[PDB]
UniProtKB/Swiss-Prot annotation, chain A:
Annotated stretches, region: Sigma-70 factor domain-1: 1-28
Domain notes: Contains 4 domains, connected by flexible linkers. In the active conformation, the domains are in an extended conformation, each making extensive interactions with the RNA polymerase catalytic core.
Compartmental location: Cytoplasm
Protein name (database record): RNA polymerase sigma factor SigA
Task of the protein: Sigma factors are initiation factors that promote the attachment of RNA polymerase to specific initiation sites and are then released. This sigma factor is the primary sigma factor during exponential growth.
Subunit and partners: Interacts transiently with the RNA polymerase catalytic core formed by RpoA, RpoB, RpoC and RpoZ (2 alpha, 1 beta, 1 beta' and 1 omega subunit) to form the RNA polymerase holoenzyme that can initiate transcription.
Family, per entry: Belongs to the sigma-70 factor family. RpoD/SigA subfamily.
From Swiss-Prot, chain B:
Gene assigned in the entry: rpoC
Function recorded in the entry: DNA-dependent RNA polymerase catalyzes the transcription of DNA into RNA using the four ribonucleoside triphosphates as substrates.
Upper taxonomic lineage: Bacteria, Thermotogati, Deinococcota, Deinococci, Thermales
Top-level taxonomic group: Bacteria
Family of the protein in this entry: Belongs to the RNA polymerase beta' chain family.
Subunit structure: The RNAP catalytic core consists of 2 alpha, 1 beta, 1 beta' and 1 omega subunit. When a sigma factor is associated with the core the holoenzyme is formed, which can initiate transcription.
UniProt protein name: DNA-directed RNA polymerase subunit beta'
Coiled coil: none
Length: 85, 157
DNA sequence: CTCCCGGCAAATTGT
DNA sequence: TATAATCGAGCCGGGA
RNA sequence: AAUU
């Protein structure tokens, strides 16, 4: 019943999401270059804010404990970028 | 659908008693009122490039490929020539019958007028939009918002 | 009322 | 690692 | 399934 509450994608919608995901990974790659931050750490911080306050936990491969202190710092450092970055 | 901005300068000749003097014509505005039908005639010899808008038309005479004249036919003026037609100085291009006005989609900014005999020749500075349609396929995304302003080379889809 | 869960003897053997 | 695939298959007593 |  719960899966039947998410409608199936249109050919257009499928491509849009797939497209946005590819572009999004590419964005994270660039944010790594600009900032010098581990691509995974950036990815987990981005992902943290999307899913919401609900899910915040330590991620294995990452060197730093992932907690609201670090995600605010890292998100605030990302928002410290110039408009084109 | 991209409505492209075209700003040009095209001429027209009308009787003198039949035309209403204004410095500009808003679209739909009455340009002249003819007591009897009038034949607008060629002032150059050339091959005809006919460009028809929704209402109203543009007409362009060329020798070689170089345009020698640019004429504007407002509403109430029916082209008597077809694209690629050879014309000689003095042959009627369009008949103008009754009330002729600016078309609904096209304007007249500045209007200069010279008077010769019983006619006036208007040198019109005209601005109008020509629509072109593009079909967007499922694997394509439109990267431009509704009402955006684009120059040559800007990506739409 | 209805339903939902807990009970329902002992020891022994044998394929 | 790439056609496309998109929702399963016994009777009995007592206490909320 | 037997035995008591």
């Amino acid at each position: 019943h719960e899966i039947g509450q998410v409608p199936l994608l249109t050919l257009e919608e499928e491509v849009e999401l797939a497209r946005k995901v590819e572009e999004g990974m590419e964005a994270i790659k660039k944010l790594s270059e600009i900032t010098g931050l581990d691509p995974d750490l950036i990815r987990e911080v981005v992902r943290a804010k999307i899913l919401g306050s609900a899910r915040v936990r330590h991620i294995p491969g990452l060197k730093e404990t992932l907690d609201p202190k670090t995600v605010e710092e890292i998100d605030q450092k990302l928002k410290s970028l110039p408009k084109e970055h | 659908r991209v409505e492209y901005v075209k700003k040009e300068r095209a001429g027209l000749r009308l009787p003198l008693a039949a035309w209403v003097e204004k410095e500009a014509y808003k679209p739909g505005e009455i340009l002249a009122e003819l007591p009897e039908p009038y034949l607008f005639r060629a002032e150059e010899e050339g091959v005809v490039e006919l460009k028809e808008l929704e209402e109203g038309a543009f007409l362009v005479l060329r020798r070689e490929d170089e345009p020698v004249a640019t004429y504007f036919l407002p509403v109430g003026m029916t082209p008597l020539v077809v694209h690629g037609e050879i014309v000689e100085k003095g042959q009627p291009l369009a008949e103008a019958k009754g009330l002729l006005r600016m078309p609904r989609q096209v304007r007249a900014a500045q209007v200069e007028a010279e008077e010769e005999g019983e006619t006036v020749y208007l040198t019109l500075f005209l601005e109008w939009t020509e629509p072109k349609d593009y079909r967007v396929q499922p694997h394509m995304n439109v990267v431009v918002p509704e009402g955006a302003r684009v120059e040559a080379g800007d990506k739409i889809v």
